[model samples]
Target: LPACPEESPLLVGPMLIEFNMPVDLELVAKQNPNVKMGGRYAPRDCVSPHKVAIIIPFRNRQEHLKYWLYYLHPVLQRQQLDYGIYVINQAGDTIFNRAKLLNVGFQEALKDYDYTCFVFSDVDLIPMNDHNAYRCFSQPRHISVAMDKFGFSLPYVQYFGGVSALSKQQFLTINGFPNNYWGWGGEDDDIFNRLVFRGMSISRPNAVVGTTRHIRHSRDKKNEPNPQRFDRIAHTKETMLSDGLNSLTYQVLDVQRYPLYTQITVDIGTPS
Candidate 1:
């Protein structure tokens, strides 16, 4: 356990250093009481409950992850989010379905702690600012409003990427993202359509705080959607009641609890 900066005269070891913002120990402890006090830094063990559980559904993107973790670790810690990075690794090399892996992550995250918010994130995207709250607000919030990939902006009016947060209640109500969205293109749209169908409006941060980093990756195969997704997006409300978490099922291969986060490895079925 480390003491706060004011309490400790010496700064030593890997510290829970913040970015542009100053790290307030008082605020950090209020959010999470179990934070260990050591030689002037809070370690991973000090993670809080009302924290952001970053759910990254990934497969064959280790390089991108390296970039993401590098940039995001400091940014998130600065925001003072009681967060743990959960990388939901797809177990098989079969065609990857990100949405299903996300579902597995949601369930897996709940197993370790009663996480109130879940951010369905990509392993490659990193936030450029520290003020971006990874936790969900009263309304469903989309944090990735401005992305560098698409001319440093959103590609579409409905685009919610880089990252997004959902309250536990909001997620269950919407039934979670569609598992049927078997590829890349339609899942985001399908999620957007889900938010719209629920009568809940999307909340966003000002563009300045909403900027993000984009890691480059080769295109994933079999991610191209089947023709029905366009229609699914149109009728997202109609099937959401039966299509999300209720329909989700998977096998958890491992759960590793670190002081900062709980890592969950699950077997996302081979792409159908």
Candidate 2:
């Protein structure tokens, strides 16, 4: 392992975060302390290269969130990134629009601080390797290249699910993710299409370094398959301009800062 900055008080390594190892959320929080209140961490010795915002579009997944924070917080701190974790929870029990919640996260997180990099992650997925570097690069990054669900290999070439990172400029270049993708299917493809349309390529770490684990759970009640996904993905180029962050609208219900992370609840209206 390479020597990290002296002020960074984290265990650095290339080892996988143990999956079989049991994690008592309270115990993990007790052992690995947070320097700053509300799920934010920064190196004490040096200024970080990028200020990253870890945005998770969440709805009714408390167990998953616990695992994510327990593993990710330490890994991020070890990487020496000045970062904040935002859990964007949708208000009401209406159908879950994953993409819209992400848009809300982006907007709300910026209100609290100027975050130059954004990592839109799924609540259930936990990165196994700390060396993967959750920070952004020149191009958009697909950090979860090797997931246990996919047999520890990318299922396909355009597999941009799990966890991803993009610089602020890069995210704006693509106008952010589509807010129309309710439920699960095509939001990722739509984002990829936007990236490709703007002449940007996607990048990922090697399988060995980019491994992640999906905490197995059945799909949510409201998170059904979007019937319009196939058609929307097909017409991504046409609708790319008008249907993204610029058109995003939401009402912030509450913002709570906890010991390990910030939770933002918002009413993002109903799906169109």
TM-score of 1: 0.78
**RMSD, candidate 2, Å:** 2.9
Candidate 2: lDDT over CA atoms?
0.84
Report, for every candidate in turn, its global Cα lDDT versus the true structure: 0.68, 0.84
Provide the RMSD of all predictions against the true structure, rounded to 1 decimal.
7.9, 2.9
Off by over 4 Å in 1: 1-49, 256-263, 270-272
In candidate 1, how many clashes are counted? 10
lDDT of 1 at 62: 59
Writing each residue's lDDT as its tens digit, candidate 1 over 28-59 gives 44454443331011235334334456788876
lDDT (Cα, tens digit) per residue for candidate 2, span 138-174: 9999999999999999998987888999999999988
Name every residue pair that clashes in candidate 1: 1-37, 1-38, 2-37, 2-38, 2-39, 3-38, 44-259, 44-260, 45-259, 51-82
